[PDB]
Design an enzyme around this catalytic site. Sequence first.
Site, mmCIF file in Angstrom:
data_model
loop_
_atom_site.group_PDB
_atom_site.id
_atom_site.type_symbol
_atom_site.label_atom_id
_atom_site.label_comp_id
_atom_site.label_asym_id
_atom_site.label_seq_id
_atom_site.Cartn_x
_atom_site.Cartn_y
_atom_site.Cartn_z
ATOM 1 N N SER A 1 0.742 -1.199 -0.173
ATOM 2 C CA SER A 1 -0.016 -0.093 -0.033
ATOM 3 C C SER A 1 1.005 1.361 -0.065
ATOM 4 C CB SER A 1 -0.963 0.055 1.100
ATOM 5 O OG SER A 1 -1.871 0.864 1.193
ATOM 6 N N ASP B 1 -5.568 -3.318 -3.691
ATOM 7 C CA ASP B 1 -4.360 -3.049 -2.431
ATOM 8 C C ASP B 1 -3.775 -4.311 -2.087
ATOM 9 O OD1 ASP B 1 -4.500 -0.898 0.099
ATOM 10 O OD2 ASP B 1 -3.135 -2.642 -0.139
#
Lengths: 344, 344, 344, 344
Positions: free
Chosen positions: A51, A185
Amino acid sequence: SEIKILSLNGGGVRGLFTITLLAELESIIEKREKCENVKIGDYFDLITGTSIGGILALGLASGKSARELKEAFEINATKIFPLKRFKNKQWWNLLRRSIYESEPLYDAVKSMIGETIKFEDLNRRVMITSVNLSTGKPKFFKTPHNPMFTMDREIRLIDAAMATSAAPTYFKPHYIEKLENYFADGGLVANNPSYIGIREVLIDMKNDFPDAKPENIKVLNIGTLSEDYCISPETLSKNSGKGYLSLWNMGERIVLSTMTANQHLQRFMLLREFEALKIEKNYVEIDETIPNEAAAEITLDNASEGCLKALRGSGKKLAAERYTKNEELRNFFLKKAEPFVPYI
Amino acid sequence: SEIKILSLNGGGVRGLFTITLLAELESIIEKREKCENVKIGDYFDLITGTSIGGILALGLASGKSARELKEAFEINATKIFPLKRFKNKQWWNLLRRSIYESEPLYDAVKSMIGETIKFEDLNRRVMITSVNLSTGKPKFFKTPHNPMFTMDREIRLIDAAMATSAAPTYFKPHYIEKLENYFADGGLVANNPSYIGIREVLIDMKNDFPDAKPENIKVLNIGTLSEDYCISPETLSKNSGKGYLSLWNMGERIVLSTMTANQHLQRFMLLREFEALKIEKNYVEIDETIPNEAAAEITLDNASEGCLKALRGSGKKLAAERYTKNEELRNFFLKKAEPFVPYI
Amino acid sequence: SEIKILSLNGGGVRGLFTITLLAELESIIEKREKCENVKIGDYFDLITGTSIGGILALGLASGKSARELKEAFEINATKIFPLKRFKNKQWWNLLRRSIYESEPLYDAVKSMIGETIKFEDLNRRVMITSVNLSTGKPKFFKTPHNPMFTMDREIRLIDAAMATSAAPTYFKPHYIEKLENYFADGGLVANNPSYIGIREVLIDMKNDFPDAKPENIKVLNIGTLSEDYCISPETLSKNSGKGYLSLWNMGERIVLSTMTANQHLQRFMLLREFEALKIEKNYVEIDETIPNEAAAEITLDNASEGCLKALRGSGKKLAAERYTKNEELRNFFLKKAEPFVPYI
Amino acid sequence: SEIKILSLNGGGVRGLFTITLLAELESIIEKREKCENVKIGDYFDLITGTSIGGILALGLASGKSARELKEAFEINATKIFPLKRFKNKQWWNLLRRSIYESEPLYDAVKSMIGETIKFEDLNRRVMITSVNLSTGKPKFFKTPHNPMFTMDREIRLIDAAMATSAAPTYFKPHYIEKLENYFADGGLVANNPSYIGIREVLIDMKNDFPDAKPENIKVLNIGTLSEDYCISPETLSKNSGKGYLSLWNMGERIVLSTMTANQHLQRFMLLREFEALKIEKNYVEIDETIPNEAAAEITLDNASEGCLKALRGSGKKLAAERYTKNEELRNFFLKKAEPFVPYI
Ligand SMILES: Nc1nc2c(ncn2[C@@H]2O[C@@H]3COP(=O)(O)O[C@H]4[C@@H](O)[C@H](n5cnc6c(N)ncnc65)O[C@@H]4COP(=O)(O)O[C@H]3[C@H]2O)c(=O)[nH]1
Ligand SMILES: Nc1nc2c(ncn2[C@@H]2O[C@@H]3COP(=O)(O)O[C@H]4[C@@H](O)[C@H](n5cnc6c(N)ncnc65)O[C@@H]4COP(=O)(O)O[C@H]3[C@H]2O)c(=O)[nH]1
Ligand SMILES: Nc1nc2c(ncn2[C@@H]2O[C@@H]3COP(=O)(O)O[C@H]4[C@@H](O)[C@H](n5cnc6c(N)ncnc65)O[C@@H]4COP(=O)(O)O[C@H]3[C@H]2O)c(=O)[nH]1
Ligand SMILES: Nc1nc2c(ncn2[C@@H]2O[C@@H]3COP(=O)(O)O[C@H]4[C@@H](O)[C@H](n5cnc6c(N)ncnc65)O[C@@H]4COP(=O)(O)O[C@H]3[C@H]2O)c(=O)[nH]1
């Protein structure tokens, strides 16, 4: 021998704490060792991120110092997460479109790492975690430290960075044209890439490090002010017999428990494995649980200058404190890591 | 030396395939070896399970044969998943209360394993994967194969079985009185406990197996007709710009992507690790994918007579074929595993 | 010695996956070996195709690169299967006339392979499967690698490609003027021509390869995202006592079961034959089962933009993964195949 | 050494011709050799059948003479295909329910072989072809000539006979309780099991015949008055551009063309392989084409006494004519085949 791994967790805005800690660490090494042009990426044989930690990992692997990456974060922090869109997060906007926009994130990441650098142009081994939504399997972008790796040798770093930061509800899924697959993600699989980083050294990076064992592996994991998620005891006690709307309010409680438990799980197997080998000192974790009052303010996507100040302050504080006490932390920056030269 | 591990995945009513394959395997050994009263749990040094696989894992660990567990499964399958609740899965019911009930499942487990057997009474080692909703960390119920383990020595098996099978939406969370904590399905952290099973032998199961290495570990992972979930390419192409209604239809698409990717990951580290030491044959996986038309019929909680026949037929079919071809499958039942006695 | 065979299946639009996998394979060889103007058809002593795989086989046999065929297919994929006719697959249309048209397919093949090349002009051996509707026997179009073979020496390649792609209900039967016979799809007798390809080398190609045995034969079968067809268990359980309208809805279930069973059989004969000689590694099959949600969208004739992206994405991903892992796949391109000179 | 294989095709009532030819051949052997109680099943090391050929194959494998089965088939032929049926084969009846009933066929087969006999009790190697509708793959019922497989040892022969004779449109699919799977006619997969019989000897029967080659294999394929199927030239020329109702009238012209072409294809490999080794005399095929006028009369489900007389007459005349001329036919009955002892 010795193998050093740098692992960054995913924390959205909280990645400012991750980069501030690294930037403050760089300044300490410069002052104490009387050195100049100190890059924190030169002391690690592998950098793994996820991330917002994936974006910083690519920047450090590219060749930019943590201080340079630190400045680009603060300027773009209020652009990646606009105040108007942050305030407007009601259910009607949540169920109609994804919050925020992907272009400000694209421009922000473009400033740090660039827009044309590819994984074959990197002199530092990297791994970026991601989830392939089209297939369902997790896809891990990484430099070709394995000579047989030909899948993402010509994939731009900005595509991998934008793919790993595509939070399912905070950003729309990232479409990679070179692969024709949509990505989500990387925190859906490994929000703490510390465990998978050790696996890579023992499996993939077998040409540069043939005799690699977990004993000779030191991991420096920088958290993002991890908050241990759990269902409130009052909610569980009174609403355990209800469905969705009350208990597991929409998908919120089911997903958050899933990532938190999975993140805890991968953290555990790392702790258990090092315990069984009596090498628990090798895993140097630098994280600090955020207090209750600050938790309501310092959220995943809060870019207010008040919350930005706290994250920057915590990063400076932990960097100074842990360097003074943790001798193993100081041993990480004793020698520069060898550059990664891909084998053709 | 050899260490054998049995891992059972979690799939609700599809666990009938898992138990039918084991039941068919038991009858094959009886006929070919001309022996009577053969229990499939006597050939494994550790049995790991999750959700419905966990319930069957406790049955084999207790001492009941797979055929006896299979017989109790078919009778109780309709009661666990009544047709009245199965057809009424509309949103106005899912948004108010969790579908199905825990009482019919509780009686099914009670007739399966018992009501007063505790982990200290078991003669075979076992895992039970679960999620501690009160704390957020994953909780693993297991026998005291590590002599220092005192948490589950006085926990009834029926409590662990109901904890691992408490699907977040299909069942209400299970409250264990002895622990004062609420628990959810173990499939949130490990739907395939094959990888975590190998970690146990090298970490905690050191009292009985001091020289335990992955080379001397053979794993018999029995599938549950796993379905590779993925987002529809038409949905991703058309609805990537939307949120939580078209893309991620409520929380359903976020959770399924998370668990499948996590389940894919753990299998990937499992396959990558064995491939590193060129001992990939040590991992024996017995599973097949459901055809598209059948997959629409064979769901997680479908107890129709036609669906039950297909699951039973698949288990009998796979057991006969894999026994003939896979010699490593036959090598599991060459010698009975030594009984596990707790150390006091 | 060594004989290399390339086999392609028929999947309509799914043949884009077959050519995308071949196209990305060409780029990998060019990048890793620093070569230029590489052709995937120059490494195989025999190329076999069926339906949409036959058209690609003819294109590679002439000397066109896989990348050029990939570009040609994408432009013509929409033209071959128009959206207006794809959406209009109702019952009155299907009961009155064949779906789609042959002229768009004729032009697509014309721009892909040409309109004047004949089997005697080819420098690479090829075989195309088809069904002779006028006689009922299966007719195979092939280059005169047998010196006594004079039936297809002076027939255009486009006629063979047109004949093999004439699906019984998706296209009208192809009439060859030079033979005065109508032809149907080649998938009615062999959707996977891998088995018949091995027979040809040991039977017909006995002049170029006098001492040919299956141990020296390596087959690279590129699938078309094959789906394992079966009747749904609910349909079988509830409608086994009915006829046509309920069970075997018209001819759909009978033709699909017969084709799937025949396709499964020929693959089974190949696996059994190779495993009897301990040469199972010689059969390299690159195929993947479609997920259930994706299989609903990715049909035999869906040319929508979203579906085309997934087929291209799977081919790009599959080619990179199998090249890294499967050493036998890499050994195919270690040396170019000798040119085929038709003996006179 | 020599290996003798008997292969019987499937043609419904046309199987009476197969049994009459087999029964007549017993009479010639008795008269010429001056012996008593001669069963042709004792001269074959493997018996293969399909549809009505499979039922006769099981009867021969059990130990019953062909003459006894001929008497049983004559009386039961009217009951299997009652004259009340076969005259009301209107479209609406076929559109609603499958024609004929399985109970008269079930009772007929019971009188032939029995109900308690199983494959493990057979003293002659057999192989029966069928297609598993539940899975879509072909399922082959066979005796345990290869000791390493155990699936059909506890399956009654009457279940395999019922499964292999379950014509998709003439009988309901056969459900086997011991396998929980539905089955259909084996003619969909291999209407002529002559080719697969040779592969069975060279693959599965490696215990009794380790050094087995196609040179030392003799095949006696007895047809059922096979009629080559082809679309009418007038229909093809006029209705090429039409769909279903005109060309491919429902599924009939697709299933028949697929069935006859696959049967042609399998025979072609048998012919092509034998020509390669110059052993074409090994494949002794005894079949004749039914003249056109009686072809419309003698169908696969015609139970009229006139057609039975024609089938009996053709079988009686073919056995006498071929025995005098075909020397290789006489060599089949020179010596009795060794009994099959299932190794344990
Ligand atoms: N990531 C990657 N894979 C490549 C490359 N070139 C070839 N490949 C091949 O593609 C396969 C799938 O890649 P993925 O990243 O999409 O899935 C990966 C990823 O989801 C996971 N994985 C990889 N390294 C891991 C690690 N160190 N820790 C945990 N999980 C890991 O396991 C999957 C299978 O890895 P593998 O090495 O057996 O197979 C690779 C590998 O053989 C390449 O440049 N990058
Ligand atoms: N499971 C268990 N733990 C016990 C017992 N008695 C004492 N403990 C202790 O409690 C700790 C936490 O238990 P948990 O099962 O709730 O969390 C576990 C579980 O979530 C996970 N874990 C345990 N074994 C694992 C394994 N083999 N693979 C993957 N994850 C595993 O890691 C956590 C920490 O394990 P640990 O062995 O270092 O610490 C134990 C252990 O020291 C006992 O009887 N059972
Ligand atoms: N295909 C073909 N056949 C030719 C040619 N010149 C002469 N012939 C002859 O015409 C016969 C019928 O051709 P077909 O392809 O329509 O039928 C073929 C085809 O249906 C099938 N067949 C051929 N090669 C095969 C193979 N390799 N695998 C499986 N089936 C195969 O067997 C049939 C007869 O085998 P064959 O090659 O000995 O007979 C040829 C062959 O002897 C020619 O140029 N092509
Ligand atoms: N036929 C059969 N297979 C059995 C039995 N017990 C265990 N098996 C195993 O199950 C597999 C699949 O059985 P199937 O008969 O349903 O599918 C079979 C059948 O559809 C086909 N087949 C088998 N023998 C054949 C043959 N001789 N010729 C042509 N096709 C053949 O190939 C499939 C795979 O055969 P295999 O021998 O590699 O694997 C068997 C075999 O290892 C048994 O009693 N009979």
